[PDB]
Structure 1
Amino acid sequence: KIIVKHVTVIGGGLMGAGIAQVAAATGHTVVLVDQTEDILAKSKKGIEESLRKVAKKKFAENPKAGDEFVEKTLSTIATSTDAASVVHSTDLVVEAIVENLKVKNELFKRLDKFAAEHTIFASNTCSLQITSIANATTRQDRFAGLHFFNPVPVMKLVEVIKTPMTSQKTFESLVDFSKALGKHPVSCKDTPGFIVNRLLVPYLMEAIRLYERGDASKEDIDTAMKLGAGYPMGPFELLDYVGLDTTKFIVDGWHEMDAENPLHQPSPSLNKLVAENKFGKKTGEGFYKYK
């Protein structure tokens, strides 16, 4: 049973950056990997802002301690554009790239050849099947899902997904790691969307359909869900927060799998926004515009 200490995070986007931030803030040595040096600089810069906020609040009285905290956490995050070399010796690979089965499979099939034998592979996928991605490698006993929640520095949940091939030792290492991160792991079966997404995503699509039906405005729906059901964000605010591209990819995947299911019927409005590269907060504009 390995103890996760050196963590390789593939993808420095919304989730990848957050995962790297929390892992580094909790004493793990992290290596954040992405496609270009510019994307990585943007990711690390973003992680700094997220930590800076904490510092200015959590260390109001002790400013120097705050800076030290921010600097030390950032220093614990290395960057690279060559995953293959980085995984040679790493305890865990947490993949957080585009929600696309083929792309993830190709990624893991390749890394499986460069990673040390003890290395554990984990996918932060929202809707794909872990068993499917695991079989893209010959390391199934060391493969499982480790699903975090947006934004990683705040959301306490982490869904741990075993495939029937995942070993108890691998499972345990991931559970321990989740806790070391200060998170609350919940073991889930390898079913589409696991728990949260399986219930959240269809709800967000119903929200869009209500709007498309012409029954209410996005503003009123968001206001209603927040003031009537006590939700932190209305569905449209949340969609933009999460990313319209990721949501669309998720629903398209389920749609292909069960085309006759009306619950996975894609949305024209959603498709139009994604087609115009308006992914929400990521790009500065989604259902709503952001400065």
Structure 2
Amino acid sequence: MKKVFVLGAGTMGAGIVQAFAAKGCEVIVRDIKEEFVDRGIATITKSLSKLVAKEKITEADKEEILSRISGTTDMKLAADCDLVVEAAIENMKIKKEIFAELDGICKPETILASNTSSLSITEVASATKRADKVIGMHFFNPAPVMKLVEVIRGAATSQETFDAVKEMSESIGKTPVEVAEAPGFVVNRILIPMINEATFILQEGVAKEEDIDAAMKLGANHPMGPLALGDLIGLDVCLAIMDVLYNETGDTKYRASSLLRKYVRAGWLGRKTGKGFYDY
């Protein structure tokens, strides 16, 4: 593969763009308004020169990265990409429309991947005439740094598509891992209920915030506590995944705490709002 189309210039999207571009790929990023497109190319530029500002790479690098990246608000520029990675809104009806469009636009070889945290690759695939070519390719924030890629096979995803996405992952310096589509895949299915369990502990008067977090840091050697991790992931993203696990499985085991819900309702979403489990 040489060329990649990335939908969404949000923070995941922008990270995905940088992860591909930084490793020699051509990347066209597409969003709904060029203010959005511009914001992302900015995010990356910032990102890169923070790196130059630690000798990690050079300006010759920084510039050759950025030359690999174009922006657009027009879906039609996906036509010739060898890969598409969709990092757009976590909404199935929309995703289905997006993928139906890419299917009409892209050359028959283009592989269409979602970065969806939660949602059905299979169902998305079914909106297309190339189910064998649709797959999940799931990165973790910040995508330039986190080395894991979950490669999620839908029911109809072929051995060849899997192999290609697996190879692509390797060539951009990540470690791919095979997942048969199921709710939450592997990482979030394990990780998010951990955070939710911390909010039950808090709700129930068992321990206060800083104690809960020190407990997992010093008691299990976790790099962050679950409440802080929450604030980093975004509490709305946390909530949404718990609601998807619960809804998919029908299993109350995955019920989100009322407390997590209250916080999301209050707009105390974490770092990005200045307030989550902690005041920032």
Matched, 1:148 2:148: no
Letter of the 2:187 counterpart:
V
1:68 to 60, 63, 73: 60
Match of 2:2 in 1: 5
Query: Does the CA-based 8 Å contact 1:123-1:147 persist in structure 2?
Result: yes
Distance 1:40 1:6 in 2: 18
Query: Does the CA-based 8 Å contact 2:183-2:248 persist in structure 1?
Result: no
Query: What secondary structure does 2:107 align onto?
Result: coil
Q: Aligned runs of 1:71-150 on 2, under 5 Å?
A: 71-83=63-75, 85-150=76-141
Distance 1:203 1:226 in 2: 13
For the structure 1 residues 34 and 90, does the alpha-carbon distance in structure 2 shift closer, same or farther, using more than 3 Å as the test? same
Query: Does the CA-based 8 Å contact 1:29-1:77 persist in structure 2?
Result: yes
Letter of the 1:37 counterpart:
E
Letter of the 1:77 counterpart:
I
Distance 2:26 2:273 in 1: 30
1:123-154 residue CA offsets vs partner (Å, 9 max, x unmatched): 11122221121112111011111111111111
1:20-47 residue CA offsets vs partner (Å, 9 max, x unmatched): 1010000000011112222222222211
| Percent identity for Structure 1 against Structure 2 | 45
Distance 1:57 1:108 in 2: 39
Match of 1:54 in 2: 51
Query: What secondary structure does 2:104 align onto?
Result: coil
Distance 1:224 1:107 in 2: 43
Match of 2:227 in 1: 236
Match of 1:286 in 2: 276
For the structure 1 residues 99 and 69, does the alpha-carbon distance in structure 2 shift closer, same or farther, using more than 3 Å as the test? same
Query: What secondary structure does 2:53 align onto?
Result: helix
Distance 1:257 1:160 in 2: 20
1:38-93 residue CA offsets vs partner (Å, 9 max, x unmatched): 2222222211222122212135xxxxx6222112212211111122x111221111
Cα distance, 1:215 vs structure 2: 1.1
Query: Does the CA-based 8 Å contact 1:6-1:28 persist in structure 2?
Result: yes
Distance 2:144 2:132 in 1: 29
2:197 to 199, 206, 220: 206
Letter of the 2:120 counterpart:
Q
Query: Does the CA-based 8 Å contact 1:98-1:246 persist in structure 2?
Result: no
Cα distance, 1:279 vs structure 2: 2.6
For the structure 1 residues 34 and 179, does the alpha-carbon distance in structure 2 shift closer, same or farther, using more than 3 Å as the test? same
Matched, 1:254 2:245: yes
2:262 to 269, 272, 291: 272
TM-score of the superposition, structure 1-length normalised?
0.90
Query: What secondary structure does 1:128 align onto?
Result: coil
Match of 2:26 in 1: 29
Bigger mean CA deviation after superposition, 35-44 or 112-121: 35-44
Letter of the 2:202 counterpart:
Y
Distance 2:199 2:261 in 1: 11
Query: What secondary structure does 1:161 align onto?
Result: strand
Cα distance, 1:162 vs structure 2: 1.8
Unaligned segments of structure 1, at least 5 residues: 60-64
Cα distance, 1:236 vs structure 2: 1.3
Match of 2:152 in 1: 161
Query: Does the CA-based 8 Å contact 1:9-1:33 persist in structure 2?
Result: yes
- What is the aligned length? 280
Query: What secondary structure does 1:97 align onto?
Result: coil
Unaligned segments of structure 2, at least 5 residues: none
Cα distance, 1:270 vs structure 2: 2.3
Query: Does the CA-based 8 Å contact 1:99-1:246 persist in structure 2?
Result: no
Question: What is the Cα-based RMSD across aligned positions, in Å?
Answer: 1.7
Query: What secondary structure does 1:89 align onto?
Result: coil
Distance 2:195 2:91 in 1: 20
Query: Does the CA-based 8 Å contact 1:204-1:236 persist in structure 2?
Result: yes
Distance 2:146 2:265 in 1: 30
Letter of the 1:177 counterpart:
M
